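Morning!

As promised:
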Amino acid sequence: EFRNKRATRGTYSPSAQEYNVLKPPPEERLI
Amino acid sequence: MPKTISVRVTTMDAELEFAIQPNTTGKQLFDQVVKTIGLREVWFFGLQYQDTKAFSTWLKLNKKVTAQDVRKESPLLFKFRAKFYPEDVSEELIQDITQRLFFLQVKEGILNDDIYCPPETAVLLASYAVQSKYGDFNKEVHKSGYLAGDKLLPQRVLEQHKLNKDQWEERIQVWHEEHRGMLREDAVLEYLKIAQDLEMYGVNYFSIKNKKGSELWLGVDALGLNIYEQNDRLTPKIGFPWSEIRNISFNDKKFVIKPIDKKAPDFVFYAPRLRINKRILALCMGNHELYMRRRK
């Protein structure tokens, strides 16, 4: 779903992603 | 680095002051901001700052503020802004504060020409901004020239026509009078309902090139990614809804979109800098997250 082992590369797979308080802002995951 | 760090956070219409400490996280600062202004609909928002290279940067919430590339300035300066936009304001923005913050941020982009707006629509939007500021038109108080002090129209609209300010005010005033009886908060909402149908609303545009070296734009919005001809940011040349994207990735300046059809070839584009590809991927991940959340 997400790979980021190098500061200069990144990858994310939308199609792969599947499904108290109001939810927080999305958090940036990149290095 | 001091034990107590002064911070200024500016929303579209307020300057706020906070004191953080060396170990304070972005999330802790963000939580203080939203609690202060009474904002519950927080998921659209973020804190932006100028980094040490003078580029706008989103603050990471799950990291210490001081561990990020904030400048050697006191106080530290941040702008609180919407990073993500709803698919429909009527489905998601219930609070007055949230509507107002979106209204002011969007209006700023309309007025500075960042968000294209047809002239007649610009006049109608202006009239809702006026209803919000002034309430019901009243011939006894709102005499000719009552709008003289306001910046109400996009610079492109002013420059491309040969109306003077009085002539524009006349068009806006007629609409203003039509809005009689409308709550100021309802005028803000109506403004947003009109603005959200503009083709450039809610789209993050990036300058890219394709393999042939042609200049294009990449747009990221709530619904996916789009590729636009250099000279047409209103209608995508190619659209990629989330459901049609198997993967997006980058290496330095090179960005790749892989379609869900494994037999179809990848789309390759080139951004100006690594920083831009990181921005694109972050906005894709965040928009897609909210897209799914809406539909849970």
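Chain B touches chain A through 41 residues (CB under 8 Å).

Hope this helps with the figure draft.
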